[PDB]
Symmetry: D2
Subunit: 394 residues, 4 copies
């Protein structure tokens, strides 16, 4: 079972969560069997996603009322991602897109602007039904994404977004973009896969996370309904309450890297147990590996707890609610990006040359684990700015 | 308030615990005021202990039935120690001796061999009353401690123990010793003839903790006060549960120290205005490690508190299950608390290097943890690799 | 020019060395142009090796008398490898096979058993002429390589033999059990054209992909009665000198990779303008580590070059005296080059994570070091503690 | 002998250097004997300094022509300091004051403004003779040090300097200060005799380590300074990268001290472990790490010292770039030492165990001594980052 800990991401807190892990169990052997291939080929395992969608799994964070599995716990979500990542991190990183979207919409449905509340409800039932599969398209690429107002009211959308995981089998896209008018207001409109002007580019050549299908999407005069635009604030002038949402949609991903470090450790320990007597060099590494794992497990589970605590709690200063969620998140992230990578490095050096063959799982794991560092929010540079800002007053 | 965290030692879990922190609040300004002197002098602040003993504090881990404050939570104990250590770590290190003893006896009282069960009950009431003050004397010094039978029956005790904190103001001593060679921990009163307390405590930090040597020279021990428990060498993993309970709480201290150092460093930097590119990183790093410490520690304590009473199931495995998290946390703390303090120190600058300055004191204080059994780094590694590799 | 240092691998010490770097200069732009493809394909750049062999480069460590370039300096060899590795580390790792073989034979020619002395001389002229291309085949794979007495027939399988793609000969380290009286070890030279010899194109490394580190299976290969060199069987510390000479230069490669990574990251940051508080630290750390690597490595090379010819004095201690600095430097490199590259990568951001991007290639390439014998970390620890603790 | 390395601070490069180590040899056993006391007392070993001064050692960096020992090599100076620091770091930290001053004045004598050149020559002879003992007073303390012009012309000096090592037994002080007037605001380092009226030496040195070094505060209260002893060099705020060369020469040698401390710590830890017999799986690794880091320190440091020694005299070429070219390797080395010497000591301490933690025990002294370097300008971590990133990023 590996490194165990109380409040350290080992068992699910909620029975929804429990149900979800049980469902995953039947998919894991397949995920694992296919992992090498999907990695070599850089190929999203569409077939397995079909089975999962049909067996209710892509509906996991969809409330029970709307036909989903009603997993509301970021802890449990993270934990589920860790299990999957144990077998294939690419795939987890993709399911995350769905799972988090569930939650982010589920908040909108209960607490968003009265007008958008039913659209949220719509998409949620669609996800529960196995019909809708939603990706966020966030990162612009050398050219900012803009939608403007066409002649008859209706808006036309134009831009290019990069690193959209799971976009392979997407049916919708929530596209964060700025809108052009005096005022410059920003928005995240829902856009169907079948929208004319939309092309999915298969240019995903990542060193790891290859099975995740993090492809680019170009929008070229895409028609967007007058009603599907959700204008929320504006660029530059940022509000700390936005940080709550920002937290909810990324935090769960940390389970992935814990998952990878766990997997690497498992492989390395069995390998060593299979050699007999243990040299003075390895005892130390193992002890260090496990100590770092424990540090990861607990640091992460704590941040998740904080986030789960304020997930619904809306009373109190909103700006402070954001900060209060984001800070533990960013601490844990800083820790994971340092330690998961070290654990994997050390598991690799403990196994030896065989681990360096690209076919070998450790090789895959070493390439996969380095992905976290890059993810916003935040990389190290921003991470420092944010966390020093919070600490020093400004 | 510093670095805060859910399940990270910030607030007490139990109302006993909450009551305890409130009591401590009135002592802290004094503790802090005296810290520099008590440190320079290497002098246990006996006067402040008197007040605490009399205000019920030294009976914190004594059940309510027996007149104590009924703090049963290692989490809350640890947290209390962290607050105190914020102001003076030596003192915490000493109070730990009392607090942990409370718990260890409290277990004996409910679960120990039927014979010793009343002796436990006695001492507990005595501590609750502010009458008894108990220290463990564990580490032998170049010569193992042995009690033999005075050819009648009654036993005479002979040996030397080192680094016994709070021994200064002790009334009793639980003395782990070997007597097949069977091993035991008899209670021994301060007033026992043949007992000398040596004031030879010259540690680089934890100076106020009075970790003095005690020599026993043919000390009379009642036929009834000997508690023979197994034998040295052949170890049982269930012993690890007890071993865990009596040390784990100490980890709060180093968290306490790191927090303190952080507080100092941060206010100092705030007071400088614009913040150079060097410091932003160090601050971010400092806090991240703090967050890691808080949560890693609070987790181990949680595990410990969970199995504290839970006696059903394999006892060997219960020990392991408590000790392992403890050792992981301890490995982390010994690395990171020291780092945090180091970094806080470099952040503040030259001034921090004056012995009088609190950082200096803190930097010397923090290095103490690494040495504590169980376990240091070498044993730590052996244990944790053993658990991991099967053998 | 990157991080510069006196006695830190920045300029060549000998004029042979200087001549060598100048030759390389014309190949670098091509090497760099081809690097992505050669990497994606996992394909040894045979065409560029032909040009280099013909332009005298593969004879760099072949003495002047025998028509080679007479580069005798490990420092300079290392430095050369760093330049090349700057552009493609796979390629460097391949050329190393040639350069080191140059030196190892050149030692044999002057100091080896009188009998083998002309064979050495032969191969050396061959390499200088651009005719011979020599790989060592060292690592057995799940089954030890053995030659027996039929003239001898050779049977086994060797793995990770770089440059074996375009090899003409193979020195094959193996143990011998000539159908008679046991048991001695030897490194016979074996021609590429020998019947029973198959080169397997199964090189699927995560990095060092262009180096062609393929497997060679020998199946009853005929070896002359005269081409067998039986050396010992129980290890001797004087072997460590040879062992050192043939690997130490490789450390240049990782220095090369770290430098490359740094260059890329820095230009990328310079191109962004204002520099956030997080990056100033990382840059300072990156460069400090680089300076550490440069100087630690150049030092070990200096020690190796000092004892390269100096044969007077205790031979066992000569080995130790070369190997120990080597192992320190290797311990440092395998830790720091990887760190510098990790940090350069995180400084550049997402784009660095695209397999096509040079950083991604550099990140996968750099990890290779740690596996290389002698020594990995486990053995590395055993050796360096053994030397330190007496036994 | 410990961790050995070619170009790693093990033997002296020059015969003046060799001569200097030999002299030191007779003082080491005494230094070591007194180290615990001098440390507990926080007391500069004045008596031993007297013997050293009289045996010529305090004029080690004074040229032969002027009756000193003519040690011109930063490598060898650093190495000497490493030997001494092996026995008492406080002391080394004080001698450094003398040795570096020798060099910095030796540069002035040959290459400073034609007017100051004989003053330099004066002080050098004085140091060589065992008569003069010169400390730098650099760090202001909550109030900047200023000298103004007394209506007559002659200047009166006013301020407070901190952490001036060896000031205990000082005869002169070079005092870096700003001179504010009329503005512009020009800066200077005038020589000031110990006996100058208005000068008080405060014995308030309570460091956690380096306790024997006598790093006391000096307050100047309207001290009379000759019209001729003021050396006005540029002005604050607007810095020039050629100043970096001087700045390097006067601090770089100190790095030998921390190497010295780490080596000492290692020696103690290893003998202690050898004395225990069989070696557990935990220690093998730590030893291996300790030694690797020592090798790293040795070589990193000796490299920077070589760079420094190379440009010490070489004045042709871009002066601004000469400074940078010296200071950068120095700062790299410093960043490594402040990290690793502390680690090596930490690890040696954990290897020895509880005994090490007794304040009387040498490790305890060493652990408190080693942490001193991080604080030394130039540069601490914060500035170090700033400088090093500046050089790397263009600006």
């Amino acid at each position: 079972p590996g490194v165990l800990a109380d409040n350290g991401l080992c068992e699910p807190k909620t029975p929804a969560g429990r149900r979800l892990l049980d469902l995953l169990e039947r998919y894991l052997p397949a995920l694992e069997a296919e992992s090498r291939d999907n990695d070599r080929e850089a190929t999203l395992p569409v077939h397995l996603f079909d089975r999962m969608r049909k067996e209710g799994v892509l509906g996991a964070t969809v409330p029970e009322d709307l036909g989903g599995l009603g997993v509301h716990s970021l802890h449990d979500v993270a934990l589920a991602l860790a299990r999957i990542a144990g077998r294939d991190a690419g795939v987890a990183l993709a399911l995350h897109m769905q799972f988090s979207r569930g939650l982010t919409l589920d908040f909108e449905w209960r607490h968003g602007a009265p007008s958008t509340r039913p659209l949220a409800e719509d998409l949620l039932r669609q996800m529960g039904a196995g019909e809708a599969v939603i990706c966020g398209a966030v990162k612009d690429v050398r050219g900012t994404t803009v939608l403007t107002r066409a002649t008859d009211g209706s808006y036309r959308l134009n831009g290019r977004k990069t690193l959209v995981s799971m976009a392979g089998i997407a049916t919708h896209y929530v596209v964060s973009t700025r809108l052009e008018e005096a005022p410059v207001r920003l928005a995240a409109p829902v856009v169907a896969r079948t929208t004319p002007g939309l092309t999915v580019l298969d240019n995903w050549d990542g060193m790891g996370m290859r099975s995740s299908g993090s492809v680019d999407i170009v929008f070229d005069g895409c028609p967007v309904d007058r009603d599907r635009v959700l204008p929320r604030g504006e660029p530059g002038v940022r509000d700390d309450a936005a940080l709550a949402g920002q937290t909810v949609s990324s935090i769960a991903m940390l389970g992935i890297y814990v998952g990878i470090a766990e997997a690497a450790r498992r492989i390395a320990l069995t390998e060593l147990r299979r050699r007999g007597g243990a040299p003075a060099g390895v005892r130390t590494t193992v002890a260090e590996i496990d100590a770092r794992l424990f540090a990861l497990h607990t640091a992460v589970a704590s941040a998740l707890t904080t986030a789960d605590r304020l997930a619904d709690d809306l009373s109190g200063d909103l700006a402070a609610r954001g900060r209060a969620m984001m800070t533990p998140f960013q601490y844990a992230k800083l820790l994971v990006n340092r330690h998961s990578v070290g654990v994997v490095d050390d598991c690799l050096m403990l196994v030896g040359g065989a681990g360096y063959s690209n076919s070998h799982p450790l090789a895959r794991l070493y390439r996969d684990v380095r992905a976290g560092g890059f993810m916003h929010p935040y990389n190290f540079t921003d991470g420092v700015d944010y966390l020093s800002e919070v600490a020093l007053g400004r």
